[PDB]
């Protein structure tokens, strides 16, 4: 009666009831998200604590098992999920104080209140309106005022709150034998099993920027081009030596340059690739869109969709008193239950979103054969990257023409190719610097070697080197501008978005090579190539049973992260940028400011 068999029997007892309870809870959650009503609300409680009232006890009894000698790596890894102290290591007062501070910070961040002084009785929130008006306009006064007001009424009273949150999170990190909460986050990309596949938390810190510097010549070029368009859009507001302010990026944070794409259009003569008029003319309902997505998925190589999903899952227009939130989600309710939740309509964007959600469902089924504690991806980014692969391949013009979205006699050329490529890069490679700098700043703030004074101003100079942003209004210590973001107060690791883009680029590039296609990467199509889908499913079926480094070995030949697909994809854009902004000089200056 060795302890290994005792642990195996404990897992066998645990997993069945855990699956049953998780299935019940997920079914209730899906019902409430499909039936917005008070009756479905209390049910959450009736399950919620119960889940904990089942999980914590199993976590309570997952300590006397000596999880240090089990030969089966799968068994030890599965048991490691239950052998987690969590936040229970802290005292009750500390835990309740942390919970209260998280609640208040999230509520105050989500309840941003800015009233225009002319009409002080009508404030505006993060919901459309002020953000919508300032994100789509051509002005410097209103945008800057809105940015300052938002950073003032969210930053003033959250600086001590975020400080206390960070220090208590770090304290509980030491409470769980972690010298830093940054290491706690990096533990997702941490494996110490098979030799040659192990990864460490410290290595990832440098590896994140090791693949980041190579896009600096490209991204800056776009910025230079943007700056060129800035000299064609903003008269005497951005110096050619310097760069643009925060509120002129199109968003209050400047994560993406989509809001600035219209200003920086490369060639507006050629219309963009749009076939939504065809689906409206051809009467493409939600059913037709889902059927075509299913057919393309089958052509790729994934197994055909099963029944039950087409009836239980909602597809379009909650409509009447039977209301439902339809934010794009793919629900893996467990026990062989997979459903979609998204308002599908007659749009190519809705087509791509449906492709994304159903690819998420397919990936969920791919590792559904894994046990309850292994039915997840190797890391956070793999799920979203896999979901986005098919959406990327479902928008290629060749794919549209094959299923007859584009005209059968359509003819694309270099002008629309360059326009589309720049449009994609303005968001894809235009967000990597901001994501990397935010992740690094969060790494320092969790590690805490920087003092509390070195929070704002350091940020506001560091953003100069990476994102290329000047200060429209000063910020010394009286706000918390970085802390006033959605993925800063909800305890969300921000490296997932950085990793997802690189993973999806690598997978798309590898599929394009091993899919029998010729030409540029942006026009690559994986339709009717079942070998590529078979290799993709070989990757997907691993789930959590294999390390992420070992997972990154079937579709792609590199277990680590590389930047080569990023440069290869935007090759025509890079060679157009090289001879486009010849008059101006690339790079920005960190000394110039709009006020000086």
């Amino acid at each position: 009666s060795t302890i290994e068999e005792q642990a195996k029997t404990f897992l066998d007892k645990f997993n069945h009831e855990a699956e049953d309870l998780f299935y019940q809870s997920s079914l209730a959650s899906w019902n409430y998200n499909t039936n917005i009503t008070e009756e479905n609300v209390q049910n959450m409680n009736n399950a919620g604590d119960k889940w904990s009232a089942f999980l914590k006890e199993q976590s309570t009894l997952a300590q006397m098992y000596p999880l240090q000698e089990i030969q089966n790596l799968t068994v030890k890894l599965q048991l490691q999920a239950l052998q987690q102290n969590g936040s229970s290591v802290l005292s009750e007062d500390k835990s309740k104080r942390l919970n209260t501070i998280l609640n208040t910070m999230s509520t105050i961040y989500s309840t941003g209140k800015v009233c225009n002084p002319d009409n002080p009785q009508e404030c505006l929130l993060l919901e459309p309106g002020l953000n919508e008006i300032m994100a789509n306009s051509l002005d410097y006064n209103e945008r800057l005022w809105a940015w300052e007001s938002w950073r003032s009424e969210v930053g003033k009273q959250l600086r001590p709150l975020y400080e206390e949150y960070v220090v208590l999170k770090n304290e509980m990190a030491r409470a769980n034998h972690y010298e830093d909460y940054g290491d706690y986050w990096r533990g997702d990309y941490e494996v110490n099993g098979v030799d040659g596949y192990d990864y460490s938390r410290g290595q990832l810190i440098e590896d994140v920027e090791h693949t980041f510097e190579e896009i600096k010549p490209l991204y800056e070029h776009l910025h230079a081009y943007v700056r060129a368009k800035l000299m064609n859009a903003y008269p005497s507001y951005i110096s050619p030596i310097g760069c643009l302010p925060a509120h002129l990026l199109g968003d209050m944070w400047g994560r993406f340059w989509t809001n600035l794409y219209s200003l920086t259009v490369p060639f507006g003569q050629k219309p963009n690739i749009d076939v939504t008029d065809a689906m409206v003319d051809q009467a493409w309902d939600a059913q037709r869109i889902f059927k075509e997505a299913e057919k393309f998925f089958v052509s790729v190589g994934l197994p055909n969709m099963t029944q039950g999903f087409w009836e239980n899952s909602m597809l379009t227009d909650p409509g009447n008193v039977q209301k439902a939130v339809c934010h794009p989600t793919a629900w893996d309710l467990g026990k062989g239950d997979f459903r979609i939740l998204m308002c599908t309509k007659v749009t190519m964007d809705d087509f791509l979103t449906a492709h994304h959600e159903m690819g998420h469902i397919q990936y969920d089924m791919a590792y559904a054969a894994q046990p309850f504690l292994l039915r997840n991806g190797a890391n956070e980014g793999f799920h979203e990257a896999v979901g986005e692969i098919m959406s990327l391949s479902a928008a290629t013009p060749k794919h549209l023409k094959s299923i007859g979205l584009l005209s059968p006699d359509f003819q694309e050329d270099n002008e629309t190719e360059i326009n589309f490529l720049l449009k994609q890069a303005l968001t894809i490679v235009g967000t990597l610097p901001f994501t990397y700098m935010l992740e690094k700043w969060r790494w320092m703030v969790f590690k805490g070697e920087i003092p509390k004074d070195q929070w704002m101003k350091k940020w506001w100079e560091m953003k100069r080197e990476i994102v290329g942003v000047v200060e429209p209004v000063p910020h010394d210590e009286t706000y918390c501008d970085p802390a006033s973001l959605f993925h800063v107060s909800n305890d969300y690791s921000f490296i997932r978005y950085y990793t997802r883009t690189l993973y999806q680029f690598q997978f798309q590039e590898a599929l394009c090579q091993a899919a029998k296609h010729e030409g540029p990467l942006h026009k690559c199509d994986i339709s009717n190539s079942t070998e590529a889908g078979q290799k993709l499913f070989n990757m997907l079926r691993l789930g959590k049973s294999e390390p992420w480094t070992l997972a990154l070995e079937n579709v792609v030949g590199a277990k680590n992260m590389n930047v080569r697909p990023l440069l290869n994809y935007f090759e025509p854009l890079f060679t157009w940028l090289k001879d486009q902004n010849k008059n101006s000089f690339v790079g920005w200056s960190t000394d110039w400011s709009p006020y000086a």
């Binding site: 009666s1 068999e5 005792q6 007892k13 049953d20 026990k335």
Partner: protein, 247 residues
């Protein structure tokens, strides 16, 4: 019944029609290992044994010769040389409950693998470690019996399937169950060959006026040559004459 309490039935002394069930589309799985389903109606055994229960959909492949699994080892076991057939069909519409078909249970833990054609219904608490589980479950205690979470939405694999396995025993005692025989029509005044109730021969059949006692089946005149028969259905006496021949 339960998988570990499989319902056992003995069938003997009747005529068994197999093609009637074989020619049915309501059975999801129909696997025969002894002989072909068509040939089954020809030969016959001395008795039949039926094991009936309902299991999970994914476990149907577990019940087979040379197959192992939790059901195949701790709930019900079959030998490698099993003779007979297995018939399974979905019971999601009936057995699975909206509130959960937790009435059904399966044996998850057992000290030893079950023997072929053997049933275990023990409810003794199982022990996985050195600590003796004295009554109430402790650390190394796990219940052998686990319920079922059948729901209307559980995927095809989790739907409960009704499974019945038929085995045939042909002990040296006289056979008691056999398939239907099928009888043709009757002709007269023509040289034909016949197999009346297993008695075969050629000749021409005519109407006669002999008076059998109520228990004879045929008759012979002398030198032991059959001359008359009684048809098993109409129960009338027919006379046999050899077909004409000569030089």
């Amino acid at each position: 019944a339960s998988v570990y309490a499989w319902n056992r039935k003995r069938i003997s002394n009747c005529v068994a029609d197999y093609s009637v069930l074989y020619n049915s589309a309501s059975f999801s799985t129909f696997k025969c290992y002894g002989v072909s389903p068509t040939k089954l109606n020809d030969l016959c055994f001395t008795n039949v044994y039926a094991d009936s229960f309902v299991i999970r959909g994914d476990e149907v492949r577990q019940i087979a010769p040379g197959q192992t699994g939790k059901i195949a080892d701790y709930n019900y076991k079959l030998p490698d040389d099993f003779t007979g057939c297995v018939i399974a069909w979905n019971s999601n519409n009936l057995d699975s409950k909206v509130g959960g078909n937790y009435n059904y249970r399966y044996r998850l833990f057992r000290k030893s693998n079950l023997k072929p054609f053997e049933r275990d219904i023990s409810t003794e608490i199982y022990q996985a470690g050195s600590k003796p589980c004295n009554g109430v479950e402790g650390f190394n205690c796990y219940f052998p019996l686990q319920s079922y979470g059948f729901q209307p939405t559980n995927g095809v694999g989790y739907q409960p399937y009704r499974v019945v396995v038929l085995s045939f025993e042909l002990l040296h005692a006289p056979a008691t169950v056999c398939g239907p025989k099928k009888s043709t029509n009757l002709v007269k005044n023509k040289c034909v060959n016949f197999n009346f109730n297993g008695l075969t021969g050629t000749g021409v059949l005519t109407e006669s006026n002999k008076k059998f006692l109520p228990f004879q089946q045929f008759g012979r005149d002398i030198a032991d040559t059959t001359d008359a028969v009684r048809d098993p259905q109409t129960l009338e006496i027919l006379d046999i004459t050899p077909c004409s021949f000569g030089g």
